[PDB]
Amino acid sequence: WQARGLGTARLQLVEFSAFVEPPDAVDSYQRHLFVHISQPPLESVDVRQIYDKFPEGGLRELYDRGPPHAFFLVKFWADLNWGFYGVSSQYESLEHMTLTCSSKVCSFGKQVVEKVETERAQLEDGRFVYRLLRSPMCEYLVNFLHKLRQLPERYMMNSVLENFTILQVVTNRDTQELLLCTAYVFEVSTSERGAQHHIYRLVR
Numbered sequence: 706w707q708a709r710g711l712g713t714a715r716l717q718l719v720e721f722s723a724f725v726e727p728p729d730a731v732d733s734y735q736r737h738l739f740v741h742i743s744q745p746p747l748e749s750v751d752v753r754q755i756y757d758k759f760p761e762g763g764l765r766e767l768y769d770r771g772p773p774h775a776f777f778l779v780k781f782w783a784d785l786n787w788g789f790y791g792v793s794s795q796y797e798s799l800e801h802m803t804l805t806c807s808s809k810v811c812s813f814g815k816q817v818v819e820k821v822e823t824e825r826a827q828l829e830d831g832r833f834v835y836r837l838l839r840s841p842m843c844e845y846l847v848n849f850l851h852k853l854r855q856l857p858e859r860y861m862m863n864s865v866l867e868n869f870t871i872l873q874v875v876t877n878r879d880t881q882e883l884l885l886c887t888a889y890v891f892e893v894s895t896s897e898r899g900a901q902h903h904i905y906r907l908v909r
């Protein structure tokens with residue numbers, strides 16, 4: 706009954722990216738992905754080890770109310786060499802729901818920006834999809850990339866990214882119940898390698 710991917714029986718994640726398109730993309734399009742998830746049981750990380758990096762809206766509260774199986778950790782190795790900055794998310798379910806998608810950016814485990822969005826069902830192939838596509842990146846985060854990208858040393862980037870975390874909570878708006886809560890922790894990938902992720906189940 707343990708998850709094989711990032712999702713529950715009640716809300717799969719299909720794809721997720723954050724990307725930059727250069728102003729030169731109007732003529733000859735190209736995409737650069739800082740992070741990307743496109744979609745044997747997932748490896749397991751104790752939720753108590755990563756309380757310190759998120760508020761106390763907090764990870765402890767949200768796991769306490771549950772459900773435990775909805776909680777996931779993604780480590781990202783960002784690709785940080787490369788305009789419009791966008792984040793695209795897509796989800797699926799078998800229910801018609803209305804989704805509310807709360808993205809908390811935390812620096813040293815304090816909330817620094819929050820984004821909250823709604824997306825309603827679109828029935829496609831017996832399936833409900835929720836397309837949150839090309840949402841413009843929050844200005845702090847685009848600034849946090851340009852500043853982070855000019856660091857002399859990648860261990861400096863990881864040192865900064867050590868204290869930079871993001872908490873996404875996806876809830877049915879109507880029923881107010883939690884569907885999917887994802888903890889993001891960041892490293893920089895080396896320049897020759899592109900973006901990577903490892904996805905864990907948060908347990909207790």
Ligand SMILES: *C(#N)N1[C]C2=C([C]1)C([N]C1=[C]C(C(F)(F)F)=[C][C]=[C]1)=[C][C]=[C]2
Pocket residue numbers: 723739740792808810818819820840841842843844846871873889
């Ligand atoms: C703001 N803040 N944002 C616009 C937005 C965001 C961030 C997310 N969350 C998210 C962002 C990243 C990355 F920093 F861009 F890599 C990684 C994971 C989650 C989601 C939707 C819109």
